[PDB]
Amino acid sequence: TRKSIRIGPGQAFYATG
Amino acid sequence: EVQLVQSGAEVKKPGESLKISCKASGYSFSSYWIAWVRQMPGKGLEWMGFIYPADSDTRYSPSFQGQGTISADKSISTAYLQWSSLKASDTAMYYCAILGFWGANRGGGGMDVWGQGTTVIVSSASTKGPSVFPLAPSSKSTSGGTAALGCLVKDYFPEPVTVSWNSGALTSGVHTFPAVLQSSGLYSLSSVVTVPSSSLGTQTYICNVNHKPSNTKVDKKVEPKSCDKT
Amino acid sequence: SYELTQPPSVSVSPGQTARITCSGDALPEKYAYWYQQKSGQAPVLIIYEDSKRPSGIPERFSGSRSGTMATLTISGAQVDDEADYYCYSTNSGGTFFVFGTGTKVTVLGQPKANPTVTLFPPSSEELQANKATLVCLISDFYPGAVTVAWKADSSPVKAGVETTTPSKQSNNKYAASSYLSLTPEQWKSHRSYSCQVTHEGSTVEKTVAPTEC
């Protein structure tokens, strides 16, 4: 996925999957 | 070369609409989030929101929701920020930036490619040349030190003005200060030169003020005060 | 809404270590990022995911995060490291990013210098234009911070004051200016106006009067 954003350990920015 | 190029400086009035642009090149525009950052004069960075150009997924911080619309046109690799009704408080530098372009920051939240910024001024003021007032050197004798003399360049809009002395023939001791902005919406600044207090009654001092946006030029001679019995 | 707190001012001498903190209640689970912004320039990413430097960023910049605090450390501070530094992170819900309030890092690269102060009264020409401006010009000071207070007949005046932030001169000392805006009536009715400039341990005061020359 190119849209996903890592924002913390084991966590992505909301709805970026 | 990976690059974001922003549109040019803008001066607008409250109530007017404005759309500023961020042109991407050198990479796949659809695949990276583009963010917009506001910086009001002398203040900190504020994250307004961002957009993923592939599907135009757009998010705003709560205080910026409805305060400026972010969009993108991937057919010309351009992201936008726009207002339908500008406010004076929209006065700011605006940056666009790509998220996660380089190295292990890819897939991450670091903004690592930045546009050069777009300055936006929103003001109810209309264009106006300055009034130039002489700032007369003190009457006091110095034995034999210096005196400060200058020109007050008052109530102009927009920036900038340039100032010179004796048609550029006087440079040492010359000091031109940055502008202040009054609640009237007009700017003022001062330019001062420090000279031998002995040369007062002798030398001629003339400030040359140029305000291009209003096509105004003013030359003003600055002499000792009348009450100055020298 | 979510905010990240930073001290506004940190000062160091060249070669010393500067530490810049960033605090927020979502930081225990969210990465911190750091941006450097020099005067006149766009921000630059210097740290991402707490501790990682992009290539080209000098190793003297390091970062960490623990609980509600993230820290940017500048070891062996250089004169060119003087800049604003902003932390950056998401809220706990991961629905927006925010910048910290910013820390100005001052690197003391020259000796202290006290300001020269010049105060001009309104010209009779300006008075005739139905306006009045006292102009207080401040120059050759270091470091780049001063406080300006205006007085009328020895009482504090706050209305009508506009002061510029310090700006770097060619000689690397600083300048600033402060304006007191009055009606010609106010100017003529008082007997003294003073501009008082404070810097470190020095106060410089200049005074003008409508009835004196």
Side-chain angles (χ1 to χ4, degrees):
Chain A
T1 165
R2 271 205 159 176
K3 186 176 183 184
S4 186
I5 309 172
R6 300 182 305 273
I7 62 169
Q11 296 184 348
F13 200 89
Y14 166 66
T16 64
Chain B
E1 182 205 9
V2 190
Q3 200 177 176
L4 299 177
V5 180
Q6 297 184 240
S7 48
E10 300 282 0
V11 179
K12 316 290 294 186
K13 296 205 170 59
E16 296 181 337
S17 71
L18 169 69
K19 182 172 200 174
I20 65 178
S21 68
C22 177
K23 170 69 181 197
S25 60
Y27 76 99
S28 305
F29 181 70
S30 297
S31 302
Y32 302 85
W33 289 87
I34 292 299
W36 283 96
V37 178
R38 182 175 77 164
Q39 184 165 46
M40 294 176 293
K43 305 304 184 77
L45 303 176
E46 309 171 83
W47 188 90
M48 305 180 71
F50 65 1
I51 184 161
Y52 194 69
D55 56 9
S56 282
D57 190 347
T58 305
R59 319 287 183 79
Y60 302 92
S61 57
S63 78
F64 286 92
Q65 186 77 38
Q67 314 302 312
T69 300
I70 297 172
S71 63
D73 180 349
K74 49 180 183 167
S75 71
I76 60 177
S77 301
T78 302
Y80 301 96
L81 174 61
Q82 81 183 284
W83 300 264
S84 67
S85 190
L86 289 164
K87 293 182 291 182
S89 54
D90 294 322
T91 298
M93 168 84 81
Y94 295 88
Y95 297 102
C96 57
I98 309 175
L99 276 66
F101 193 81
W102 294 112
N105 184 50
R106 297 171 61 82
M111 297 186 286
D112 53 7
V113 174
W114 291 73
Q116 82 276 21
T118 296
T119 294
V120 174
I121 293 173
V122 190
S123 168
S124 70
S126 304
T127 304
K128 175 188 179 301
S131 289
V132 179
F133 301 107
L135 302 171
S138 179
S139 47
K140 301 291 178 288
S141 56
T142 68
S143 286
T146 56
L149 66 95
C151 278
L152 173 56
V153 184
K154 189 169 202 303
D155 292 342
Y156 61 88
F157 181 88
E159 305 210 63
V161 297
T162 65
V163 186
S164 79
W165 288 87
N166 288 7
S167 302
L170 173 54
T171 38
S172 57
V174 174
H175 200 158
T176 299
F177 293 69
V180 84
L181 175 63
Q182 311 147 79
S183 64
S184 73
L186 307 172
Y187 300 90
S188 305
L189 60 69
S190 306
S191 173
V192 61
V193 60
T194 301
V195 299
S197 75
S198 61
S199 73
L200 282 185
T202 297
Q203 180 65 52
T204 289
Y205 296 109
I206 293 171
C207 66
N208 323 102
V209 178
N210 208 14
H211 185 239
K212 285 304 181 61
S214 76
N215 301 296
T216 307
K217 171 145 179 183
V218 184
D219 302 309
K220 190 72 177 191
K221 186 187 192 187
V222 184
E223 293 179 1
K225 318 173 194 171
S226 96
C227 67
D228 187 356
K229 294 183 178 172
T230 63
Chain C
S1 63
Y2 188 62
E3 112 159 300
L4 292 173
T5 301
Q6 294 181 242
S9 306
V10 165
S11 271
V12 286
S13 300
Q16 297 182 335
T17 297
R19 294 181 179 85
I20 300 86
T21 63
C22 173
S23 291
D25 62 19
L27 283 179
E29 294 168 17
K30 300 298 185 293
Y31 294 136
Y33 306 76
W34 289 93
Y35 303 84
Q36 173 190 65
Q37 187 181 211
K38 293 186 184 183
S39 179
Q41 293 186 6
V44 174
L45 180 69
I46 59 172
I47 295 281
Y48 62 97
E49 296 191 10
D50 312 337
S51 58
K52 301 171 76 58
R53 279 176 299 280
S55 52
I57 300 307
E59 311 195 339
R60 67 177 183 278
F61 295 95
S62 59
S64 68
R65 171 179 59 90
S66 179
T68 60
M69 182 180 278
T71 307
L72 170 72
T73 297
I74 307 167
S75 299
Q78 297 179 3
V79 154
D80 83 321
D81 293 331
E82 175 163 313
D84 290 309
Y85 294 82
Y86 294 91
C87 59
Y88 173 84
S89 192
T90 63
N91 64 319
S92 69
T95 53
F96 61 98
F97 283 94
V98 300
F99 286 95
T101 48
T103 299
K104 174 61 182 279
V105 175
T106 296
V107 182
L108 300 170
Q110 74 182 75
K112 268 59 196 171
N114 279 323
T116 300
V117 177
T118 303
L119 175 64
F120 293 102
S123 58
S124 61
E125 183 156 7
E126 183 187 18
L127 293 180
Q128 190 56 59
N130 200 222
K131 304 191 330 290
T133 311
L134 303 188
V135 184
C136 186
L137 309 171
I138 315 164
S139 69
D140 290 330
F141 59 95
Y142 189 89
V146 286
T147 296
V148 186
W150 286 89
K151 292 174 189 83
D153 294 326
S154 287
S155 293
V157 186
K158 285 276 178 52
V161 179
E162 293 289 348
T163 302
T164 68
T165 69
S167 55
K168 221 170 85 174
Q169 308 180 165
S170 57
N171 72 349
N172 292 117
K173 294 183 188 179
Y174 286 81
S177 57
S178 188
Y179 291 84
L180 178 54
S181 188
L182 299 173
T183 65
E185 289 64 41
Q186 286 173 299
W187 165 248
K188 290 170 200 157
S189 67
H190 296 77
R191 284 298 171 268
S192 75
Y193 285 95
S194 57
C195 176
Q196 162 173 130
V197 181
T198 299
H199 175 75
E200 305 281 333
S202 87
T203 294
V204 176
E205 179 180 62
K206 299 293 186 161
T207 303
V208 291
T211 71
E212 254 87 26
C213 183

